[PDB]
Nucleic acid binder design. Structure first.
Ligand SMILES: [K+]
Ligand SMILES: [K+]
Ligand SMILES: [K+]
Ligand SMILES: [K+]
Ligand SMILES: [K+]
Ligand SMILES: [K+]
Ligand SMILES: [K+]
Ligand SMILES: [K+]
Ligand SMILES: [K+]
Ligand SMILES: [K+]
Ligand SMILES: [K+]
Ligand SMILES: [K+]
Ligand SMILES: [K+]
Ligand SMILES: [K+]
Ligand SMILES: [K+]
Ligand SMILES: [K+]
Ligand SMILES: [K+]
Ligand SMILES: [Mg+2]
Ligand SMILES: [Mg+2]
Ligand SMILES: [Mg+2]
Ligand SMILES: [Mg+2]
Ligand SMILES: [Mg+2]
Ligand SMILES: [Mg+2]
Ligand SMILES: [Mg+2]
Ligand SMILES: [Mg+2]
Ligand SMILES: [Mg+2]
Ligand SMILES: [Mg+2]
Ligand SMILES: [Mg+2]
Ligand SMILES: [Mg+2]
Ligand SMILES: [Mg+2]
Ligand SMILES: [Mg+2]
Ligand SMILES: [Mg+2]
Ligand SMILES: [Mg+2]
Ligand SMILES: [Mg+2]
Ligand SMILES: [Mg+2]
Ligand SMILES: [Mg+2]
Ligand SMILES: [Mg+2]
Ligand SMILES: [Mg+2]
Ligand SMILES: [Mg+2]
Ligand SMILES: [Mg+2]
Ligand SMILES: [Mg+2]
Ligand SMILES: [Mg+2]
Ligand SMILES: [Mg+2]
Ligand SMILES: [Mg+2]
Ligand SMILES: [Mg+2]
Ligand SMILES: [Mg+2]
Ligand SMILES: [Mg+2]
Ligand SMILES: [Mg+2]
Ligand SMILES: [Mg+2]
Ligand SMILES: [Mg+2]
Ligand SMILES: [Mg+2]
Ligand SMILES: [Mg+2]
Ligand SMILES: [Mg+2]
Ligand SMILES: [Mg+2]
Ligand SMILES: [Mg+2]
Ligand SMILES: [Mg+2]
Ligand SMILES: [Mg+2]
Ligand SMILES: [Mg+2]
Ligand SMILES: [Mg+2]
Ligand SMILES: [Mg+2]
Ligand SMILES: [Mg+2]
Ligand SMILES: [Mg+2]
Ligand SMILES: [Mg+2]
Ligand SMILES: [Mg+2]
Ligand SMILES: [Mg+2]
Ligand SMILES: [Mg+2]
Ligand SMILES: [Mg+2]
Ligand SMILES: [Mg+2]
Ligand SMILES: [Mg+2]
Ligand SMILES: [Mg+2]
Ligand SMILES: [Mg+2]
Ligand SMILES: [Mg+2]
Ligand SMILES: [Mg+2]
Ligand SMILES: [Mg+2]
Ligand SMILES: [Mg+2]
Ligand SMILES: [Mg+2]
Ligand SMILES: [Mg+2]
Ligand SMILES: [Mg+2]
Ligand SMILES: [Mg+2]
Ligand SMILES: [Mg+2]
Ligand SMILES: [Mg+2]
Ligand SMILES: [Mg+2]
Ligand SMILES: [Zn+2]
Lengths: 138, 208, 124, 104, 83, 99
RNA sequence: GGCUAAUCCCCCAUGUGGACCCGCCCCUUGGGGUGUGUCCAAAGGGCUUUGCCCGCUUCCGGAUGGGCCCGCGUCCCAUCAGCUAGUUGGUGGGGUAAUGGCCCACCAAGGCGACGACGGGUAGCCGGUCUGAGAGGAUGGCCGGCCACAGGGGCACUGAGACACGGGCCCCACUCCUACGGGAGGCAGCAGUUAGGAAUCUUCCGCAAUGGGCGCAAGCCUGACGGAGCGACGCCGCUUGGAGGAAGAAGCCCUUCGGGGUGUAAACUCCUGAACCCGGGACGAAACCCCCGACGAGGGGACUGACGGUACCGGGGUAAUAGCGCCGGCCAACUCCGUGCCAGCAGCCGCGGUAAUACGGAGGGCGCGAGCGUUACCCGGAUUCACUGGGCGUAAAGGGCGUGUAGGCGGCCUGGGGCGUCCCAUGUGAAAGACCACGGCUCAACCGUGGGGGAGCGUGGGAUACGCUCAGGCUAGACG
RNA sequence: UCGU
């Protein structure tokens, strides 16, 4: 049993990107899908699609990267440089609208989960609501 | 206890010329002509690359030795500036530049800032028609700095205000030489002042 | 430590141990001399330092350094301790204040005079 | 408003009085993680009307005795010793940590 | 009884009182019930006396007993002027 | 020395006496009626209960009992009497009780 | 022992009304209405004395003040792990303004604890204060709020209120008077003395102002307060000069012996003019009172200033205190002589053993300046107890291993509830302080007015993604 | 042997 699937996903993604995989599957959950949406919408990942593996529901997340580079180590820049779990089972993190953080002077984002649904730090602020600060991404 | 001691020796230590006598610090005698080097038995010896601290410290000493203020009052102003809204560097120079004794010097009512100081302490100066004997009194825009009638006929005030005939005055100021009046138009901008001081180094000095 | 662990035990605020048990945590303590020996320095120094056993008003018996060129401290000399260890003599953690009570001030002292307690010479 | 709390009856061994264990949840003042804390209350029960496992609503009331300032405002749900048992075991747990100790 | 009096707030030689509504038994500069005015004995400014007359009227309507000097000032602001 | 306001002490003793004495009567009469009521003697138990009622109120006329101390007394008194008369009583003199 | 007045005490009456018992109704813990029975009132005084004033009695309400109760929060040690008999609850009673083991009688056998009981240590708590980027740490003097105490302990009396700092009683310790029987005391009020201590002030002026007590008022009391005194203890302001001019020193004291430095610096020339038994001189103070009016609203009127002859204005007018620390690196400022592991320095690293920028002195220099240093203590730097924000192969740190109790944590789908969480509105968040603005004192410190923010909690309304819970389902974990 |  995974201990915290959201973390598991953020990490499958962190890992897969570090070796520049084209995509990566993660056990499917409405919730994880919700997060993927923002990820795609914000353009950190090409996209994602539901796919069964061994007859079980996963989410093929399609990674995205920058262009090949110069000098030694022609490895591309990551689109998802960062990406960390904030709230966690056994240290849940909640915030009010006035406490939503401004990830990377705006160049980054934060994904909260509100009773209005999973939103980015700008959306949540827009609809004036707060909630569980799920993660950070830049 | 505003210092009080040999002055055309601070300029020597400060490398740059500090006009702390007004007159003479112009003639071929300000020493900065013959002996621009620091004072003392080692003033001519080979210089040793100053430390970051040294640079900042000397710069603070320069800017402050110009207005002849205490480190106490000097610091008080700087703190007040950090607190005010607006680039500390300038704001600070503005406040410095708003001391009555200073303004009395800018209007030429006196040769030096030191002389201008005594002129305030001795009541020869008037803000808006009322006497003000506080060298640190802060002049605000619109205030008219003048010379007490009773002082108007003073030998010094004559030679002085005479020497100001057809003489230029800072853009943020303005003086009617005849009536011996003057107005503080507005706070000088960094651009309005041109002191041998990089006030940024000063802000840094008070950040250590 | 896990957060649960921190909730369970939390961090321990570290306490501070005084170097000057001059009790009453006063700035100075008054005392009287007993011995008025001399001690050999340690580590790599060598000299005959003037020290003093002092019965403090704080019901304490301690060795206090006697700074300055020379002194006049006897056995029943009343003194004022000011706290300050002497890096060379382990066991000495307080200085005697020249200029107070029986402790005379250093005579012919012309520089760091406020210390050693010596009035200003009537230069003329 | 008079306070109203909800808890489980963990004691019935008193005449006209039941012990109500009330639970409370909240983020830790410095470490954040939500932590469960609780307190036992001695609510007043004139008709011996309530028994163990009973989840009741306690209401702030005029003192009925020393150590007893609440009345049983009503039953929320009947029988359920999952809670009583829990309480009891934690209590039985104590029957250990000392000089002797059980085996649990 | 509850009173309407002065509370010292200025400085040495620089008095400034507050027209206050407090229980007779409290310190004078103690904790009042409500501020309803202020007074500058030396009129160092044109605004050396203000009094929320509506409020002054309230307290008097329920038993507030003004000091003589308190009453004097209140009157000066027409608290009683029925004219 | 000599703080003339020891006259207060002086006076308190006189008052102490006054109060002290009024209460004794009250207690004594009450017990008396409660005693009669119990023994079933109704007409006189009430008669006295009535005196006690009066004495109590008067005690509260000034600063002896005042407050609701009077009320408690009369209450507990009219309480015990009416009840003790549950021995075939039948409020004969229908004194203070309003049956 | 005797006499005597009253707004002293008591009796009878009147009963608006109110208290109590019982019944009924409405409300819902002892709230309110109602009926019968019962019980309960009072004080007089003053006159511009035939109506006004001060006051008295009962009741309902207001206002202010307060008691008691409850949720949550409040230091260290677990080398304190079990605690408890009025102890937990009940019934009846007592007691109180009132709830309550508050206390008592009887009955029951309970209550509390690892979410830290019990015990030990320490400590008044708060608004705030200091520090910090913040989170936090530290702290609670002055000022405002609350609590507690009045030589130590116990107790009640009188009162609307006390278990009463300048009231009372007893026990104790101590001082004092004593004809030895016995009495008298309580500065943790202002000031002052003494002791202790490194250390903390005048046996001051005034009641003029603000405020308090009593009085119809005049007014009386007020060490509260308003002021002055002493102390660089703190903060702010200010002065020891300004402008012009390089003798130039037996000796202090540098050198290549050419000179360099102190230095425009200079009891030496011109200007202003801190101080200064010199003239005038305050706001704070206009009420209570009196008269007219109607003892109202209004309107006129005597009176009264400690601070103080102070501030401040005007005149005259002297050139008129500078000190302390430091100069090896950190850290701004270097040379000579003396000394020779000595004398000594020293925050840490270190310096002195014959060329010492580190010791002491001198010249010079740096820093700050009516101050400058030192010691002590607090926060910082210290992400060096790490929540923000740390670690454990070899640096300190994985428990010798397991089993499993409490606890912490919990896969995928749906539904209910809406505890956590989030949003809205609202109440609360005293004043002071802090921040911003304007303003008063010549500035400032200081002060005045106004403005803004605000977590936490209460109330009402709402949301449901996540966490929780209840219900159902699944099979990817687990087990068979 | 001690301090460089
Ligand atoms: K046990
Ligand atoms: K009746
Ligand atoms: K009332
Ligand atoms: K009330
Ligand atoms: K209350
Ligand atoms: K009872
Ligand atoms: K602060
Ligand atoms: K605090
Ligand atoms: K504290
Ligand atoms: K009165
Ligand atoms: K003058
Ligand atoms: K001179
Ligand atoms: K030599
Ligand atoms: K030297
Ligand atoms: K520290
Ligand atoms: K080990
Ligand atoms: K072991
Ligand atoms: Mg976090
Ligand atoms: Mg600024
Ligand atoms: Mg050595
Ligand atoms: Mg030290
Ligand atoms: Mg030294
Ligand atoms: Mg039962
Ligand atoms: Mg009397
Ligand atoms: Mg009897
Ligand atoms: Mg007699
Ligand atoms: Mg009477
Ligand atoms: Mg009637
Ligand atoms: Mg009657
Ligand atoms: Mg009459
Ligand atoms: Mg009872
Ligand atoms: Mg009762
Ligand atoms: Mg009472
Ligand atoms: Mg008890
Ligand atoms: Mg204590
Ligand atoms: Mg920090
Ligand atoms: Mg700060
Ligand atoms: Mg206080
Ligand atoms: Mg005492
Ligand atoms: Mg006592
Ligand atoms: Mg009483
Ligand atoms: Mg008393
Ligand atoms: Mg008391
Ligand atoms: Mg006393
Ligand atoms: Mg005293
Ligand atoms: Mg002494
Ligand atoms: Mg007075
Ligand atoms: Mg008065
Ligand atoms: Mg000063
Ligand atoms: Mg010379
Ligand atoms: Mg000169
Ligand atoms: Mg002259
Ligand atoms: Mg006037
Ligand atoms: Mg008339
Ligand atoms: Mg009038
Ligand atoms: Mg008067
Ligand atoms: Mg003149
Ligand atoms: Mg240096
Ligand atoms: Mg020697
Ligand atoms: Mg040498
Ligand atoms: Mg030296
Ligand atoms: Mg820290
Ligand atoms: Mg951490
Ligand atoms: Mg570490
Ligand atoms: Mg090892
Ligand atoms: Mg190791
Ligand atoms: Mg191992
Ligand atoms: Mg388990
Ligand atoms: Mg779950
Ligand atoms: Mg669970
Ligand atoms: Mg659900
Ligand atoms: Mg909810
Ligand atoms: Mg709020
Ligand atoms: Mg406030
Ligand atoms: Mg101003
Ligand atoms: Mg101002
Ligand atoms: Mg304000
Ligand atoms: Mg709500
Ligand atoms: Mg819903
Ligand atoms: Mg739901
Ligand atoms: Mg299920
Ligand atoms: Mg050696
Ligand atoms: Zn110059």
């Amino acid at each position: 049993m995974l201990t915290d699937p959201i973390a598991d996903m953020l990490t499958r993604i962190r890992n897969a990107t570090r070796v520049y995989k084209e995509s990566t599957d993660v056990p499917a959950s409405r919730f994880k899908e919700e997060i993927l949406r923002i990820l795609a919408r914000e353009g950190f990942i090409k996209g994602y699609e539901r796919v069964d593996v061994d007859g079980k529901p996963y989410l093929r997340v399609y990674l995205k990267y920058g262009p090949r580079r110069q000098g030694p180590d022609p490895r591309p820049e990551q689109v998802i440089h960062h990406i960390r779990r904030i709230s966690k089972p056994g240290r849940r993190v909640y915030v009010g609208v006035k406490e939503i953080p401004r990830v990377r002077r705006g160049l980054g984002i934060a994904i909260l989960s509100t009773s209005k649904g999973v939103l980015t730090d700008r959306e949540a602020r827009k609809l004036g609501v707060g909630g569980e600060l799920i993660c950070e991404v830049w | 206890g505003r210092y009080i001691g040999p002055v055309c020796r601070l300029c020597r230590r400060e490398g740059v010329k500090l006009y702390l006598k007004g007159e003479r610090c112009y003639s071929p005698k300000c020493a900065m002509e013959r002996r621009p080097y620091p004072p003392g038995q080692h003033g001519q010896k080979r210089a040793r690359r100053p430390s970051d601290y040294a640079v900042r410290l000397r710069e603070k000493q320069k800017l402050r030795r110009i207005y002849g203020i205490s480190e106490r009052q000097f610091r008080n102003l700087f703190e007040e500036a950090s607190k005010k809204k607006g680039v500390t560097g300038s704001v600070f120079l503005g406040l410095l530049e708003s001391r009555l004794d200073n303004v009395v010097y800018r209007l030429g009512f006196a040769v030096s800032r030191r002389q201008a100081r005594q002129l305030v302490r001795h009541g020869h100066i008037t803000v808006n028609g009322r006497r003000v004997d506080l060298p640190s009194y802060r002049v605000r825009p619109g205030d008219e700095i003048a010379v007490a009638e009773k002082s108007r006929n003073l030998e010094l005030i004559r030679q002085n205000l005479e020497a100001m005939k057809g003489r230029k005055v800072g853009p943020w100021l303005s003086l009617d030489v005849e009536g011996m009046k003057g107005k503080f138009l507005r706070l000088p901008d960094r651009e309005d002042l041109a002191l041998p001081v990089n006030e940024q180094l000063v802000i840094e000095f008070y950040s250590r | 430590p896990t957060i649960n662990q921190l909730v369970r035990k939390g961090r321990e605020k570290v306490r501070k141990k005084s170097k000057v048990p001059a009790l009453k945590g006063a700035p100075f303590r008054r005392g009287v001399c007993t011995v008025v020996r001399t001690v050999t320095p340690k580590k790599p120094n060598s000299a005959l330092r003037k020290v003093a056993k002092v019965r403090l008003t704080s019901g304490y018996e301690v060795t206090a350094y006697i700074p300055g060129e020379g002194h006049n401290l006897q056995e029943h000399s009343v003194v004022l301790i000011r706290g300050g260890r002497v890096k060379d003599l382990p066991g000495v953690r307080y200085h005697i204040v020249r200029g107070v009570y029986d402790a005379a001030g250093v005579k012919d002292r012309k520089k760091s005079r406020s210390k050693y307690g010596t009035k200003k010479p009537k230069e003329a | 408003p008079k306070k109203v709390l909800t808890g489980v009856v963990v004691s019935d061994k008193m005449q006209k009085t039941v012990t109500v264990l009330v639970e409370r949840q909240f983020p830790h003042p410095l470490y954040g993680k939500v932590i469960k804390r609780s307190k036992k209350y001695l609510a007043h029960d004139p008709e011996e009307k309530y028994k163990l496992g009973d989840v009741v609503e306690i209401i702030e009331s005029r003192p009925i005795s020393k150590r007893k300032r609440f009345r049983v405002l009503r039953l929320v749900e009947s029988g359920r010793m999952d809670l009583v048992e829990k309480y009891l075991i934690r209590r039985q747990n104590y029957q250990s940590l000392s000089k002797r100790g059980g085996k649990a | 009884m509850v009173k309407i009096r002065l509370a010292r707030f200025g400085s040495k030689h620089n008095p400034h009182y507050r027209i206050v509504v407090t229980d007779a038994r409290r310190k004078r500069d103690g904790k009042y019930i409500e501020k309803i005015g202020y007074y500058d004995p030396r009129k160092t400014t044109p605004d050396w006396l203000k009094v929320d007359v509506e409020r002054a009227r309230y307290w008097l309507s329920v038993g507030a007993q003004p000091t003589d000097t308190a009453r004097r000032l209140l009157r000066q602001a027409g608290v009683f002027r029925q004219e | 020395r000599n703080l003339s306001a020891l006259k207060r002490h002086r006076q308190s003793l006189k008052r102490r006496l006054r109060n002290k004495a009024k209460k004794s009567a009250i207690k004594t009469l009450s017990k008396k009626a409660v005693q009669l009521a119990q023994e079933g003697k109704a007409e006189e138990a009430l008669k006295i209960m009535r005196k006690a009622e009066s004495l109590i109120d008067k005690a509260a006329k000034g600063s002896t009992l005042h407050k609701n101390a009077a009320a408690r007394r009369k209450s507990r008194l009219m309480r015990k009497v009416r009840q003790l008369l549950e021995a075939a009583g039948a409020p004969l003199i229908g004194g203070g009780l309003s049956a």
